[PDB]
Amino acid sequence: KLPPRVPNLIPYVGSFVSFAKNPVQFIIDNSKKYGDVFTATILGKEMTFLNHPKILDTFFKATDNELSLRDVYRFMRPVFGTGVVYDADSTERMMEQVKFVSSGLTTARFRVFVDIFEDEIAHKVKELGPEGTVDVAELMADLIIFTASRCLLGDEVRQYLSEKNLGKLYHDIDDGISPLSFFYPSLPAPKRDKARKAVGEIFQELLDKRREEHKKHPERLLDESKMDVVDHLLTQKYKDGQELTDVHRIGILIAGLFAGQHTSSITSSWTLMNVISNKKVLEKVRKEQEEIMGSDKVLDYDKVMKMDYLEACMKEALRMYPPLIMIMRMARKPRECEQYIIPKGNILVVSPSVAGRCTDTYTNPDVFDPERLTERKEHEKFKYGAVPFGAGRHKCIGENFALLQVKSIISILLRYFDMEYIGKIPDPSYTSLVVGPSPPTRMRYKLRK
């Protein structure tokens, strides 16, 4: 029958307070006591957590009529939009919409992205000057506002960032979503809604500016290097023949940009922080960069694809500090799990944060040691030993773009700057929807040329 239970402190609320204090420790602490599969009530919700790589297969291999994502991620509706992604009428429709994004993430676009990255950092060093100190998380966020927007939407968006305060609107949207929004989706957030409508109107004009741009220059549609997500959204249909609405298009763009930004700036912060405050790691990374760059002065894609150790550094940081700390599904029918029979209506939960520290998989898991991956292969010990991008049917489709964005920015900054971090490396703050480092995150920098 049912699994072991974390015991209600209180009716209805259940264990929400300890869970709230630190959701990762909550799961680890209840693991050590009640075992790899336990149910805890949290603000109304029968939440059943799966805590070991070895039980995960049925979680990742199920169908969406068995384990639903849309039942648990629909709360994102007032960020994304009605009828968009996890609010689509069907999983079939969500999947098509996820593919309109993916279709701007091609090898030919990726070559152009490295250029965009070079260009936005060029502009950013003018602000930073010959030396100074800067907040790591803020810098990465601010760069990726400009780089993600141009990569997915094309160059036209930039003037909205530069002159119509678009970056401020994103923030207003971003702040209006909360871990709590999962438990209470209908919470008022009039600031968020105002901005969401603001961005809605700006992207509608962006669609409209493009639609005549297509008429004036239809060679664009033949140029694989210039085709972005906006292009694909205007020119594709659903498979069954139906037209997209401009409402759906806007929504998909916003959702895509949200995915394009937070996970990446966070991961890029934790990666860069750990790299620059470890002499050995920094040395290996600089060495690789010297080797790949040779006598060229700027990046290209092919270079980025050779940056294997820098990629292991990033992946080490995802093990330790995964930005999505919990992956979840609603059980639309009872689900069997080992001895147990997880009941209908329960929310199955899997944590990449918890996986990253599991002593079965990783020696000395509190050390940033990328050679645990490149030499010891500790991730391979299980199929789901490492799931920072998920796995199976809904595995992240941004993975390659994220690897590209974060490797490029870091390589570029390392080209420009000597950098040192100030103080000990912080803990994750479990304040936000997407978990990043407890501020502040300061470093000094000095130009090298």
Sites of contact with ligand KKK (CB under 6 A): 23, 73, 85, 179, 182, 255-256, 258-259, 263, 324-326, 396, 398, 430, 433
Bond from prior residue into 388 cis (ω within 30 degrees of 0): no
- How far apart are CB 149 and ligand HEM at their closest, in Å? 11
By CB under 6 A, what part of segment 227-266 binds ligand HEM?
Answer: 256, 259-260, 263-264
**Strand pairing category for 347-350 and 327-331:** antiparallel
350 binds Ca ion (CB under 5 A): yes
Pick one of ligand HEM, ligand KKK, Ca ion, none as the site partner of residue 390 (Cβ within 5 to 8 A by kind): ligand HEM
Q: Which of 198, 178, 196, 192 is nearest to 75 (CA)?
A: 178
The entry of ligand HEM, Ca ion, ligand KKK, none that residue 401 binds, CB within 5 to 8 Å by partner kind: ligand HEM
Tell me the C-alpha distance between 383 and 242, whole Å.
39
Burial profile 127-159: b = 16 or more Cβ within 10 angstroms, e = fewer: ebeeeeebebbebbbbbbbbbbbbbbbbeebbe
Residues paired with residue 68 on neighbouring β-strands, in sequence order:
330
Segment interacting with Ca ion (CB under 5 A) among 8-16, 49-57, 316-324, 434-442: 49-57
Residue owning tokens 């960032």: 161
411 interacts with ligand HEM by CB under 6 A? no
**Residue 402: contacted member of ligand HEM, Ca ion, ligand KKK, none (CB under 5 to 8 Å, by partner type):** ligand HEM
Contact 193/176 with Cβ under 8 angstroms? Answer: yes
Query: From the CB of 436, what's the least distance to ligand HEM, in Å?
Result: 11
Alpha helices in 129-165 (DSSP H): 136-153, 158-163
Residue number with CB closer to ligand KKK (180 or 282) = 180
Residue ranges in 285-314 that form contacts with Ca ion under rule CB under 5 A: none
How is residue 377 annotated by DSSP? -
Angle, helices 308-320/399-416, rounded to nearest 10 degrees: 110
Q: Which does 229 bind (CB under 5 to 8 A by kind): ligand KKK, ligand HEM, Ca ion, none?
A: none
Contact call for residue 48 and Ca ion (CB under 5 A): no
Q: How many helices (H) and strands (E) does the chain have?
A: 19, 12
Nearest to 73 by CA among 152, 174, 179: 179
- Is residue 98 a contact point for ligand HEM (CB under 6 A)? yes
Q: Which does 354 bind (CB under 5 to 8 A by kind): ligand KKK, Ca ion, ligand HEM, none?
A: Ca ion
Question: With CB under 6 A as the contact rule, which of the stretches 117-125, 388-396, 408-416, 441-449 interacts with ligand HEM?
Answer: 388-396
Q: Shortest approach of Ca ion to residue 215 CB, angstroms?
A: 51
Contact indicator for 109, 227 with CB cutoff of 8 Å: yes
Choose among Ca ion, ligand HEM, ligand KKK, none what residue 433 binds, the Cβ cut-off being 5 to 8 Å by kind. ligand KKK
Q: Measured from the CB atom, is 27 or 34 closer to ligand HEM? A: 27
Binding site for Ca ion (CB under 5 A): 51, 350-351, 354
